[PDB]
Design a protein around this ligand. Structure first.
Ligand code: A1B4A
Ligand code: ZN
Length: 138
């Protein structure tokens, strides 16, 4: 679990969005596994606007942060799950690092701010949904 809080927006994994997220919907994209809802309170986070390919992510299944080198956002095949059919997920970045189901929502950050959130993984890989191109979040 986890979310980004920036301005009057809350960014979450679309597959973990709540009834309240959907009732306050701003934008969603199944191909990216992202949903953004509106909030009444002002956020705590800053979004990176950069081309970093290294950073640090939070891994809830280890209660720890890990450094990672990650690929540029791209179209990657993701196997079927209970949440989605087999499909290509866009704007996804892969890295070698531990992840297991429950770690989705963990934040990836570089020196500039928040880069994205955990969205996929398995077998020593971790995938992050990029948010740096969503300029309107600011
Ligand atoms: N973006 C998606 O389509 C997700 C939806 C939830 C399931 N999923 C995962 O990758 C899970 S099952 C494999 C082990 C791990 S490790 C962190 C997540 C997962 C794909
Ligand atoms: Zn950066």
């Amino acid at each position: 679990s986890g979310a980004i809080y920036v301005g009057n927006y809350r960014v979450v994994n679309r597959h973990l969005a709540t009834h309240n997220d959907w009732a306050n919907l701003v934008w969603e994209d199944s191909s990216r596994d992202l949903l953004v809802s509106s909030t009444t309170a002002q956020g705590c986070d800053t979004i990176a606007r950069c081309d970093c390919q290294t950073g640090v992510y939070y891994c809830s299944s280890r209660r720890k942060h890990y450094p990672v080198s990650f690929s540029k956002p791209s179209l990657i095949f993701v196997e079927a799950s209970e949440y989605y059919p087999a499909r290509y997920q866009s704007h996804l970045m892969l890295a070698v690092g531990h992840s297991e189901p429950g770690d989705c929502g963990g934040i990836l950050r570089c020196q500039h701010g928040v880069v994205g959130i955990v969205s996929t993984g398995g077998n020593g890989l971790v995938g992050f949904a990029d948010v740096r191109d969503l300029l309107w979040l600011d």
